[PDB]
Amino acid sequence: VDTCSLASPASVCRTKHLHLRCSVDFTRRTLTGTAALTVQSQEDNLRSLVLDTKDLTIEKVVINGQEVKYALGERQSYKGSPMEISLPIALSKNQEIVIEISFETSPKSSALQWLTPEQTSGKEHPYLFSQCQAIHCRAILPCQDTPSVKLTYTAEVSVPKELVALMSAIRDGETPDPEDPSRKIYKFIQKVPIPCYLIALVVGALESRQIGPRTLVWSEKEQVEKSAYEFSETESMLKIAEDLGGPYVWGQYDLLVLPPSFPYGGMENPCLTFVTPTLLAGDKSLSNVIAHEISHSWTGNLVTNKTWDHFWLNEGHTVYLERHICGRLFGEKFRHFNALGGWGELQNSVKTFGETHPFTKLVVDLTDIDPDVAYSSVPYEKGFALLFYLEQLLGGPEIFLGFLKAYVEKFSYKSITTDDWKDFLYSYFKDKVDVLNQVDWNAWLYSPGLPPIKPNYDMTLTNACIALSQRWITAKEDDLNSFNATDLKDLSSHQLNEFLAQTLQRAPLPLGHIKRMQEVYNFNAINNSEIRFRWLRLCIQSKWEDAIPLALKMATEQGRMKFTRPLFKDLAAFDKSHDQAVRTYQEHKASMHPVTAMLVGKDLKVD
């Protein structure tokens, strides 16, 4: 059973299809319409069922032309309120009915952010975007809000005609709204069965540019040109991924480049990947995020975690695939560079939560825990570390990629657990059961902290990063004028980034060191969001007062949680900026993304 869901489980009934008819109301900040759910009974004599909801207003439920009885339980925090629906007649096993629920979302739906015109690039129009992973789809529409159920869907969305609607689906046309001359209806169809967390909607002043045979980039006009360039390697990445995982089954692969308050680096919404505009470095160096989202078209979207306890299946395999894409593009030495950097990130998150903290476990029991609170890089990097370790244990990347593709085929269109994965691992590698049996599975899977064994990493591209970092860390005052802009001359931006990551792990540095570093390297002027992020953290943790406005500015002028949360935490920990940080959070809170606002509030202990 999915302990994050209050709905009837898949053993009871299964949603097979959703038809959403809705209208996006910017004045009231509500989605209004009808969710028609085709539900199939898995049990004899089924007379009722329960759906997840969250701050939804139910207008009426209709099954076969007649309204039926329903009730809503008490709100269980982030889990929302269970909705019990009495069926007009009892269903046999495998029998299907269509349940048509009329509803309105609340303006505070945790799935949605409503932007005023001033919160956009163009400043003339409002903007709406959704984000359902993990369990926010219930805040959009009634559903079995669990990844253990997969459904196709169709949608018709009415919006002000000056705007554009897009969804995680194939575009299926547009018409004027028959009921409203100032609106348009955009139609969508998703023919591949998906978990409902992959449902997504955006509505705004969007423009499109074609950058591949199956890829348009969508954004506000201000960001389109930069985006087309930044993500120009998307189709090449797509093709590599198809080599690694088998055919792309989803048809289109479009990119949506959101406004700055989008909470994630990317979200793998099918047919339409969402991405932060903070990826726009100007040199494509952050496009590994694109590789990542692309990889999810197999690991996650095709093979899906059955519950969020097994989220590492989604993220670990995807990062594994992601780094293989980067490796094929730029070389095995680079794959190792990124992999080693991943381990560095794992070190960090483990130090942040603490080595006994439950959230550093690979498999986590999320019964009474908000997935948003448990979210971290642990499932990504401990997950990857496990797979990278197995690769080396079992004969190398060629052999382990054989397993990956077999795994994807085996479980395509299915929802699985960590046990299903490991069972298949053993079945695939049945000839090496004796090596597999030497693995500390219980430590790897269920113990907190760093994993029991570190993989082997090629150091070639990381050495120059380490050397420069160690020079700065061991440098005394009379060494400072020995640093020179020429230190950076033969370093890629990745290497710059890794140098800053290495140095940050040893923060703080003396104020004098930090001030010299700005003098000779001028990271203040760097556009790269990752680099600027680590630099500003280094500055704030080194107590440089001058950096406070820049840090506050980055934390608030964009909203990627990866950046906004640690910057706010760093600012709150620095006495000179503490009250300023908390004050800035509270002035911006109402205009922040709902999830981000919640996490930062918790991070700063503002209640």
Q: Is 230 annotated as a binding residue?
A: no
Shortest distance, position 133 Cβ to Zn ion, whole Å: 9
Q: Does 66 bind Yb ion (CB under 5 A)?
A: no
The DSSP-derived string for 90-156 is EE-TT-EEEEEEEEEE-TT-TTEEEEPGGGSSSSSS-EEEE--TTTTGGGTS-B--STT--EEEEEE
**Is 131 assigned to a binding site?**
yes
Which of 188, 375 has the CB closer to Yb ion? 188
Q: HEC profile for 439-484? A: CCHHHHHHCCCCCCCCCCCCCCCCHHHHHHHHHHHHCCHHHHHHCC
3-state secondary structure of 303: strand
Given the residues 100, 156, 230, 293, the one annotated as active site: 293
Select the binding partner of residue 45 from Zn ion, Yb ion, none (C-beta < 5 to 8 A, by kind).
Yb ion
Which residue number, 319 or 465, has a Cβ lying nearer to Zn ion? 319
Bond preceding residue 134 cis, omega within 30 of 0: yes
Please report whether residue 242 would count as binding Yb ion according to CB under 5 A: no
Q: Considering only the stretches 241-249, 318-326, 468-476, 523-531, report the one whose residues sit in contact with Zn ion under the rule CB under 5 A.
A: 318-326
Closest to Yb ion by CB, 43 vs 458, is: 43
Q: Which of 365, 419, 557, 587 binds Yb ion (CB under 5 A)?
A: 419
- Nearer of residues 430 and 489 to Yb ion, judged by Cβ: 430
132 among the known binding-site residues? yes
Q: For 179-286, where are the E strands, in sequence order?
A: 180-194, 201-204, 207-212, 215-219, 254-257, 266-267, 272-275
Active site residue 67: no
According to the annotation, is 264 in a ligand binding site? yes
DSSP 4: T
- Helix/strand/coil (H, E, C) string of 343-382? HHHHHHHHHHHCCCCHHHCCCCCCCCCCHHHHCCCHHHHH
Q: Which residues pair with 31 in a beta bridge?
A: 24
To the question of whether residue 560 is assigned a binding role by annotation, the answer is: yes
Asked whether residue 561 is marked as a ligand-binding residue, the answer is yes
Among 70, 78, 253, 380, the one annotated catalytic: 380
293 is catalytic: yes
| Distance of closest approach, residue 441 Cβ to Yb ion, in angstroms | 11
Total interface residues for Zn ion by CB under 5 A: 2
Q: What is the DSSP letter of 73?
A: -
Q: How far is the CB of 56 from Zn ion (least distance, A)?
A: 28
Pairwise CA distance, residues 65 & 334, whole Å: 60
Whether residue 184 contacts residue 175, with contact meaning beta carbons closer than 8 Å, is answered with yes
Q: Is 437 in the site for Yb ion (CB under 5 A)?
A: no
Residue entry with tokens 């997935």: 371
Instruction: Find out whether 267 is annotated in a ligand binding site.
Output: yes
φ/ψ of residue 524, rounded to 5: -55, -25
Euclidean distance between CA atoms 186 and 167, whole angstroms: 10
494 is in an annotated binding site: no
Q: Which of 172, 174, 207, 345 binds Yb ion (CB under 5 A)?
A: 172
Binding characters for Zn ion, 298-317, by CB under 5 A (x = yes):
-----------------x--
Give me the 466-495 binding string for Yb ion, x by CB under 5 A, dash otherwise.
----------x-x-----------------
- Please give the Cα distance from 99 to 31 (Å, whole number): 19
Binders of Zn ion among residues 568 to 597 (CB under 5 A) are none
Nearer residue to Yb ion within complex by CB, 478 or 607: 478
Q: How far is the CB of 434 from Yb ion (least distance, A)?
A: 18
Toward Yb ion, which CB reaches closer, 173 or 354? 173
Binding site residue list for Zn(2+)? 292, 296, 315
Which residues form the catalytic set?
A: 293, 380
- Residues in touch with Yb ion (CB under 5 A): 43-45, 172-173, 419, 423, 476, 478
